[PDB]
Structure 1
Amino acid sequence: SMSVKKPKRDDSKDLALCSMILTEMETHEDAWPFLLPVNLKLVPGYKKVIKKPMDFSTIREKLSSGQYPNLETFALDVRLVFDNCETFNEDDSDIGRAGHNMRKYFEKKWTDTFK
């Protein structure tokens, strides 16, 4: 509350560490469904059904240009990529399995780096 603060957590390396995690996600073999925005002219249903599209390139541009105020807003966009994938793709598809694998990979790096 006013003039009463918990001790200051060091957040000065967060930007660098989220960049490293994102590099690792970009270079995973199962990243291919997620590297670029889904083409809304060529994929029927996507525009109407997926209210907030997100992809790794879009996260990388936001990260590089100071559009994440803190590490939690970064994790929300990464998880959005996987939540959108589950909304649109069957679990038993290559893309559906890719998304489960990537979410697992991300969540371990997130815990090991910050928790």
Structure 2
Amino acid sequence: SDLTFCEIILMEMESHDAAWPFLEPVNPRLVSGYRRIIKNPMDFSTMRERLLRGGYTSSEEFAADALLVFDNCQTFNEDDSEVGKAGHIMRRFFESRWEEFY
């Protein structure tokens, strides 16, 4: 179905130069205040596990997780911080590739 294009997007996100903040869950023991500020953490590796398991009913639930990744990034990180700057590049990349398939 749709979800073949989700694998293309997820694979390209996973291998993108600016993906290093999003390849694994934020470790809250290492990031002060993260556990308190971000209610629903999300990251690329969690989406890959869900997608392999087939846990995405629609291309839209996949996109909701992807946008959750970048909403969380913008909530916690200043736009001029290193993680913030990476998040912006990754978010614009996502919605660019997303618009080219849907």
TM superposition score category, shorter chain reference: over 0.9
Larger Rg: 1
In the superposition, the TM-score normalised over structure 2's length comes to 0.96
Whether 2:50 is the aligned partner of 1:94: answer no
AA partner of residue 103 (structure 1): R
In the superposition, the TM-score normalised over structure 1's length comes to 0.85
Whether 2:30 is the aligned partner of 1:42: answer yes
Whether 2:5 is the aligned partner of 1:17: answer yes
Instruction: Give the aligned partner of residue 46 of structure 2.
Output: 58
Query: Identity over the aligned pairs, expressed in percent?
Result: 60
Distance 2:81 2:89 in 1: 12
Structure with the higher helix share, 1 or 2: 2
RMSD (CA atoms)? 0.8
**Higher RCO (Cα < 8 Å, 6 or more apart):** 2
Runs of 4+ in 1 over 3 A off after TM superposition: none
The unaligned stretches of length 5 or more in structure 2 are: none
